[PDB]
């Protein structure tokens, strides 16, 4: 059972975005689903639901400006939003609610068991809302110097969030860090990503940081050699 | 709508020592005959996922070092033993009434021993420099507790608004932190000056730290 959300990235101050959610692994004409947000560092609000049998609702922080839908024939929900203010701003999470189904001379039926529960979640999908444009980052490398040695990329200067950073692929992810973005006085983020290894490799083994800004369509793999 | 409030907001704790977190409703959530109240557990860069359902009821994969319990308005997510692996932010959820609503989170911290940083300087890349900017890192691996100082000198003079401070999540295995400093400078004033050095102070340190290089060399 998967949710992947789909959508996200940069919209200004009073236009429109629609989000969408792709199910996997399980019958999504059978189950209510839900959104939920969260601002970066802050907690969870439930932002709209719509039953297996496409009724909807909403809290007022949204009412009048959100919409949700499902097309059961291509396992997706969707969450249109409009008027986007910048407190809007928030990762956007589809999840399953109460499991049920329909037997066509009966109608709907939901199991008892965890109706008002939240048992599936996707990874997030970050809105933000800003009268920025997109930027793509600068990657640049962070050498090992002349036991254990620490080397990196630092991806510089971008908007919006998020970028995602792997090492080797994603073959590496011991010793790794990737520091949560700043933001800088400029407007534009900018986070280092690092790993640290034996000193004996580093004639021998390639290090190549692997970066991703969907919002601007850059991606980079830089190799990041000892000088 | 109903609002939800827990306590504490911040956990820490041993690990193999028990743990428990409450939470209280403004009004009801039984339904005469289910109660409805759920547990969330947010990892480190990670969504929420369901701990427990009504009160008591553990979602799939959760072991019964996990228990919840209460009625009506107070709650209770007990661990009877906690794992360095629980580091993470618990949301106590009612269920009884539309919009759900979620109590604020409580971020459970693991306790461990005193570890010093490692510490390491980068300067700015050749491919920074030909881009006409000037960033100095400063890493500061694996430390506990996360209290932590860095300052920056250039040839001696103490650099002050400058630099940018980011810090991870407790790493779910080792219990630590790692930070790192960037100082920012343009091109001309790297290039006019000779010392760069990142002085830590830590905990875990009998006396500050400092890594340095010369421009050049």
């Known amino acids: 059972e998967q949710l992947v959300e789909s959508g996200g990235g940069l919209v200004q101050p009073g236009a429109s975005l629609r989000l969408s959610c792709a199910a996997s692994?399980?019958?999504?004409?059978?189950?209510?689903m839900h959104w939920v947000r969260q601002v970066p560092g802050q907690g969870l609000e439930w932002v709209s639901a719509?039953?297996?049998?496409?009724?909807?609702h909403y809290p007022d922080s949204v009412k009048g400006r959100f919409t949700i839908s499902r097309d059961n024939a291509k396992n997706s929900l969707y969450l249109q939003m409009n008027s986007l203010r910048p407190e809007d701003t928030a990762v956007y999470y589809c999840?399953?609610?109460?499991?049920?189904?329909?037997?066509?001379?009966?109608?709907?039926?939901?199991?008892?068991?965890?109706?008002?529960?939240?048992?599936?979640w996707g990874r997030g999908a970050l809105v933000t809302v800003s009268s920025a444009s997109t930027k793509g980052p600068s990657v640049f490398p962070l050498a090992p110097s002349s036991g254990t040695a620490a080397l990196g990329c630092l991806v510089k200067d971008y908007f919006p969030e998020p970028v995602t950073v792997s090492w080797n692929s994603g073959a590496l992810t011991s010793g790794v860090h990737t520091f949560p973005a700043v933001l800088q006085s400029s407007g534009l983020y900018s986070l280092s990503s690092v790993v640290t290894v034996p000193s004996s490799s580093l004639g021998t083994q390639t290090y190549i940081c692997n970066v991703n800004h969907k919002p601007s369509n850059t991606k980079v793999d830089k190799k990041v050699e000892p000088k | 709508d109903i609002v939800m409030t827990q306590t504490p907001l911040s956990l820490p704790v041993t690990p193999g020592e028990p743990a428990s977190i409450s939470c209280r409703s403004s009004?009801?959530?039984?339904?005469?005959?289910?109660?409805?109240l759920d547990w969330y557990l947010q990892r480190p860069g990670q969504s929420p996922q369901l701990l427990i359902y009504?009160?008591?009821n553990r979602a799939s994969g959760v072991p019964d070092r996990f228990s919840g319990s209460g009625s009506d308005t107070d709650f209770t997510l007990k661990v009877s033993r906690v794992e360095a692996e629980d580091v993470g932010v618990y949301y106590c959820?009612?269920?009884?009434?539309?919009?759900?609503?979620f109590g604020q989170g409580t971020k459970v911290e693991i306790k461990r021993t005193v570890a010093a940083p490692s510490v390491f300087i980068f300067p700015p890349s050749d491919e920074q420099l030909k881009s006409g900017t000037a960033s100095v890192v400063c890493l500061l691996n694996n430390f506990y507790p996360r209290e932590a100082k860095v300052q920056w000198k250039v040839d001696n003079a103490l650099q002050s608004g400058n630099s940018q401070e980011s810090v991870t999540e407790q790493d779910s295995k080792d219990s630590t932190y790692s930070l790192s400093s960037t100082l920012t400078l343009s091109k001309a004033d790297y290039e006019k000056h000779k010392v760069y050095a990142c002085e830590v102070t830590h905990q875990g340190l009998s006396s500050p730290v400092t890594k340095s290089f010369n421009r050049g060399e």
């Open positions: 009504e009160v008591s």
């Open positions: 692994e399980f019958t999504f004409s059978d189950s209510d």
């Open positions: 959820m009612q269920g009884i009434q539309l919009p759900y609503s």
């Open positions: 009004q009801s959530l039984l339904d005469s005959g289910n109660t409805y």
């Open positions: 999840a399953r609610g109460g499991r049920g189904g329909y037997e066509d001379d009966y109608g709907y039926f939901y199991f008892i068991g965890g109706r008002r529960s939240l048992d599936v």
């Open positions: 719509i039953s297996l049998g496409g009724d909807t």
